[PDB]
Structures are given as C-alpha cells and as structure tokens.
Symmetry: C3
Subunit: 308 residues, 3 copies
C-alpha cells in the first residue's frame, strides 16, 4: 500500500488556512505576522513534501490512484490537492505575487476540471450508493469552490470569486440535506467517523470566502453563516466522544479546515466590531484545537503511527 | 398514560404568537393592545398550567418522559417547552422587562442545550428511521432557533438574534428537502397527519424572525419568504380534507404557530406599505383560523375529549 | 397515442425565452429587435398550433390527458402550457399590452392552480415513488413560479413578482437535493436522459427572474446564481455524450429553457458591465445551441420523425 493516504493533505491544508487566519491579524498584533509566516512556511514545506510523494504515487502506484479516483467515496479526497495548492498560493502571495497567482490559477483549474470530470460522472448512476454519501463529498463540490473563490478574490477578480463562491454555497446547500439524512439513518462506520469533522467545514468556509470577497464587510449573510456554523460546531462537540470512540487518529485533521475557517472569519468579525467576544472565543478555540492536532501529529510521528 | 401530551404546548405557543401579532398593531388600532393583552394573559395562564403538569410528569412519570425523549420522533415535541417559555417572556416584556429577560434566556439556553444533546445524537444513527422523518422535527432544529432569535432581538441583542435566525433558516433549508421527499413517498399515517401543519410554520416563522431582527424592514428576503410560505399555505389548504380525513382533533393546533407567524409578518408588511391587501387577507385568515381552533378546543373541553 | 407529446411545448417555450433574451438587446444592436420579433412570432405561432392540438386532445383524447395528469412523473409536463402562455404574453407585451396582460394572468392562475391541485396532492403519498424523482419535476414547482414572477414583474407588480420568485427559488432549493441524490444513486433510464437538461434550467431561470424583477441590477445574488448555473452547465457538458448515448431526439429541447435564461441573464449582466466576456460567451453559446436544436427539429420534421 502507499505510505501516504490522499487524505493526509488536510495537514498542509489546515496549517495554511490557520496561517491565513493569523495573517489577517497583522496590524492588531505585532507577532501575528511572524506566527503566520511560521505556519505558512511549515504548511508550504509539508505540501511540497506531500506533492512529491503523490507524484511518486502517480509514477509507480498509478493503480491505487485509479482505484481511488474511480471509487465513489475515495475520489473526494483527491480534491485536497488543488485546495492545498490554492491555499499555498494564498500564502506565497504575501512574498512573491507571480508564483502565488500561478499556483492559485493551477489549483482553480485543477479543482474545476476534477469536479466537472468526476463529480458530474456520478449522475450516470450505479457506482454511487446510498452508503457512499459521506462527509468527504464536500471537498470536491463545496470546499474546492469556496477556496477557489477566496483565492481569486485575493488576486483581485471579485466577480469571478463571487461566481465560484456561489457555486460552492449552492452546492453545499444542495448536498447537505441528503448527507445529514444519511448520517441520521445509516450511522457511519468507525473508520469513517473522523471525517465527520468536514460537516463543520462548509458553514465556516462559506463565511470566510464571503468575507474575503467583499473586503471583510460583515453582512447579514455572514452572521447567518456563523449561526449555522456554531450550531454545527455544538452538534459536533457533543458527538466528539462518539467520533473518537476508537481512539485519536490523523483523521481528526478533518476538523482542521473548519476550525481554520472559523479563525479567519473570527478575525474578520472582530475587525468589524461585531460579536467581539464570540469572535475572540472562536479564534482561541480554533487555535487551541489545531495546536492539539499538531501535537497529536508530532506524537504519532515520534511513535511511528503516522505513515501507513 | 399522562393526561397531557407534550404536544399540547402548541396551544399556549399559538396563543402567545397571535398575542404578539396583535401587539404589533398597537398604534394603528386602539383595541389591538387590549386584544393582545387578553391573548397574552390567556396564553401565559395556559403555559403556567401546562408547565406545572409537565413538572408533575417529571416528578411522577419520568419513565414516559424518558421514553419520549429517547424516541426518535416524539422527542421533537419536548422543544415546545422552551419555545413557549420564550414566547411568554416576549409577552411579559411589555410589563416586566426583567422577568421577560429571565424567561427568554432560560428558554434560549434550554432549547439550544436540547438541540445540542438530542438533535445531534441522531447522527450516531440506528435510532432515527426513514419513517421517523416527520414534520414535527422542525420544532427542535428550526422553530426553536427562530423563536430564540426573535426573542433575543426583542431584548436588543440583534447580532445574537441574527446568529440564531441564521441557524434556524439554514437548518430549515437543510431539513425540508428530505421531509418533503418522505411525505411524497411514504405518505403519513392518519394519527400523524395533523402535524403536517408544522410544514406551514417555518416559512412564516423565518420571515417573522427576520422582520423582528431588522426592525420590521420589508426586505427582498421577506418577500421571498412570504412567497414560499404562501405556496406552502396553498398546498396545505388543498390537503386539509386529507389531513382531517379521520375527524378534527387537538392536533390541528400545529397550524397555530404558522398562522400566528403569518399574522405577525402580515402586520410587519402592512406597516411597511408592502402588499397591503395580501397582508390584510393573511391577518384575517390567521385570526379566523386560530379562532376556529380556540372554539374547537373549548368544545373538546366541554365534551371531555381534550385530556387523554 | 396522440401525435404531439405534452413535452413538445418546450419548443415554443425555448423559442419565446430566446426571443425575450434577444429583445433585451434592442438598444445595443439595430437588428436585435428584428431577430427578437422573428423568434417571438415563430414561438407564438408554434404555441398557438400546439394549444389547438392540446384542445383537440382534451376534447377527444381525454383519457390520455387524465392518465398523464394522474401519473406522478408525467404530470409535470402539463406545466409547460401555462409557462409557454406566460412567455407568449411576455412577447406580445411589446405590441399589445392588454392581450399580453390577459395571457400572463391566465398563465399565472393556471400554473398556480395546477401546482396547488397536483404538486400538493403528492404529499398524500403512495403514488410518487423514489424512481419518479425526475428532473421534469422542476416545471410545475420551480420553472412555472419563476416564469410567473418574471412576467408579473414585466407588468409592474414587482412585489407579487418577488413573491412568486421566492416561491420558485425556495422550491428549487428544496427539491434539487433529493433529485441529485436520486440521479447519483439510480441511473436515469435512457428515454428519460434527455430531460436532464432541465437540471440546467433552475439556476439560470432564477437569476433571469431576479434580474427582471429588480430592473436588471447585477446583485451578489445574481453572481451566485450564475456561479451555480455555470457549475451545472459544466456538469451537463461533461455528461452530454451520455445523455445522447442512444441518439439525438426532440427531448434535447429540455436544454432550451435553461439556455434561453442563460442568454437573458447574459444580456442583463453585459448591460451592467459585470463579467462582459463571460456574458458574451454565454450568450453566443446559448444562441448556437438553440440554433442547433432548431436545425435538428427542422431535419426531424423533414424526415417525419417529429410526431409520434
């Protein structure tokens, strides 16, 4: 088997999202820029390492790549590649705008092409089963579009960012009903439970993208999106003992994207002098949770329980 | 069996919502305040009586309480307690702001805790079944959040009201698809048919909460929400002979919350000089329907067919 | 077997929608008015012919009419009559406002009554099956409401137009989740595949109606709706070889309404100096595709493969 699962890209993804969240606090906190730089450098290094490993997988393990691509449930994790590329481009935009733009456009084209080729192929039917409605399906249809929207808005194409953000938002509102119904009805196998953290992602990722597109102006839509995001956060907080029933694992990084988007939208809200205490608590909670995830990952690396 | 079903709290709920709807007409009609006071006093008295009965149930009939709480379909009716508490607090806010604030906060905390503890356990799966997707599921996930949003906005916490309103709105949009699909596919047993009136609730409750949060400004969102609410109202009007196929019962109070929210949003629309004729018709229709419900309830009390 | 299927009304519907799309370009081009006039006259003539055919069907083949109406899947195509009536009224509004208003009101009342009588009757259940969740269900619940909203906004009743637009939009958001889940799970049979083009309709029809109601002001909602519409457009472009797996047929006119709404919203966007290149490409693509559909229909008529 391939040592690095395609789902391990959540590590650089979460680190990059938290790096941007810290970057948003440059003016208010002098060491915020240094913390963001450290997080972004670590995320970029990890992403480069994982991209080299995945290129090796394509060169020598193409059978596994095709098996995961054609699998109706495991294909969604391939969307973590363009998302992480877009986030790393967002990070590099603070230093070298040209390479940042190149990475952002490569990631946008890659994720859009992947969604067009695969997510649309499911409509043929037969391969997608009622038991394949997993939270990981958000990544190609929802998370990728939101990340592309935010990245493009960062480059100055707000209208295109609005298009991508709307695609992501409506895809999320269109897929979540069936996902939650399946979770209520068919439960979820213990191995796939850790991916439930992605249910926290779309609500906060959407508001983060919206605040990035419209210059961080806190509309009514941003407040509504936080309302739903915090409802989902409470639901998943009550369920965490059930999610980790079989013990902690690297699969808990699925919460990383949601927590980092929560932190970013929290900085956006605090800048706007709206719900300041809630924003501070959300930022602290997300940072502490991602720090615990980092500590757990380092522990797993030390004990060798990281790679497969 | 306990003489008072948990679903009988719709009586004080509907009466309180209609009381607030009338209250919103303080300046236009001199007798609106008197009518609102009478309705609110009756609703508060009935709510106090029912709360005493439910405390008795907890003290002596805790097995039934545990059975309904753990039931995947009957748990949603326990959410009528905090909703009625918040509505009674809204009523009392006209007389005793401190007691009203206390009741509103108790109701908000109670409903949020109930949704966190129960509506999220369903995601574990195995207890919720495709035949348990009933209209009553709106109460803990949708109606409670909207009522908390409106109550908080009445206290002055608009941003928190916006958060709760968004939670409720997105929960409604996420749950209605599967609910309507189940209704189309699996029908609904005659005993649970009267609860179909809750399908009317979310569309009008959402617009009522929105108009309460934003100072009763008739935005485009309010018009859209009335569009959907009136579509659902026509759908349920065409189905009423089917809903009461087995005869009228106290379960028809499920329409009470929807009709009262329709009346409240109608007052809000009329104040804003938007669709005055439609607003007048909606207000009259809601008042007449709730009056018919009150007459039916009084007749059942006289006949002795009210308590179980 | 009546020669003209009820689903052939998409021809006058698509032609009329494209006629309005061209009509929106009077001032920019000199020949736009002439092209719109030609398209509208052809659409009106075809609609009159089809309405005479359907009146003949009702007078002599009422059994087929009653069979399609009571069929849970074939009933949705009866909604093409009021939709095409409203579109033809929109066309005639440029020449004779009184007859245009009469046609728009007749179509609005007809579609609303049909949705109330039939779409609501499904909630009784037992006739609608999980395999009856076809894309054609958009027509009575979604497309009709949007067309009524746009036509009413043309007459000057913006608030009523907003009500109808909101009804249609929320109905679309509430139905699409289960429709897409059904498409993913169970393959659409080859004969029903051509109707997949209706999946492209709601996203663009919604934005067209929104831009018509609000005087063609490109709002954030319009950009979001284009985002989703273009996502669906790419999904269906990737699937087209599968949709026509068994050969081209008149059922491909299902794409006509979506493409015409695309063209209309493209004119609206270009007028507003928003994404001019994307708008031009969308307009050209929609016009070319509808022209190809027209050529295919002409060839089928020449070969005698049009009527049943």
């Amino acid at each position: 088997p391939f040592p690095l699962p395609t789902g391990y890209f959540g590590i650089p993804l979460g680190l990059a999202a938290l790096s941007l969240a810290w970057f948003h606090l440059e003016n208010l906190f002098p060491a915020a820029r240094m913390v963001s730089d450290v997080l972004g450098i670590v995320a970029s290094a990890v992403w480069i390492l994982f991209i080299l490993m995945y290129a090796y997988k394509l060169r020598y393990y193409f059978e596994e790549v095709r098996a995961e691509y054609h699998s109706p449930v495991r294909f969604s994790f391939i969307a973590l590649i363009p998302i992480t590329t877009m986030l790393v481009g967002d990070i590099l935009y603070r230093w070298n705008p040209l390479i940042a733009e190149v990475l952002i456009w490569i990631g946008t084209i890659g994720q859009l092409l992947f969604s067009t080729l695969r997510v649309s192929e499911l409509w043929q039917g037969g391969v997608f089963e009622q038991k394949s409605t997993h939270p990981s399906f958000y990544l190609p249809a929802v998370a990728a579009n939101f990340t592309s929207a935010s990245s493009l808005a960062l480059l100055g194409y707000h209208d295109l960012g609005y298009l991508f953000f709307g695609a992501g938002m409506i895809a999320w509102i269109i897929f979540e009903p069936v996902l939650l119904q399946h979770l209520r009805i068919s439960s979820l196998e213990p191995q796939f439970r850790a991916t439930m953290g992605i249910v926290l992602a779309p609500a906060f990722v959407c508001v983060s993208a919206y605040l990035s597109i419209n210059h961080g102006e806190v509309d009514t839509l941003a407040k509504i999106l936080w309302g739903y995001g915090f409802l989902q956060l409470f639901f998943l907080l009550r369920l965490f003992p059930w999610i980790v029933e079989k013990g902690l694992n690297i699969g808990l990084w699925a919460f990383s994207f949601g927590l980092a988007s929560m932190a970013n939208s929290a900085t956006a809200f605090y800048h706007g002098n709206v719900l300041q205490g809630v924003s501070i608590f959300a930022f602290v909670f997300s940072n502490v949770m991602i720090g615990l995830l980092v500590l757990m990952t380092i522990y797993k690396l030390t004990k060798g329980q990281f790679f497969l």
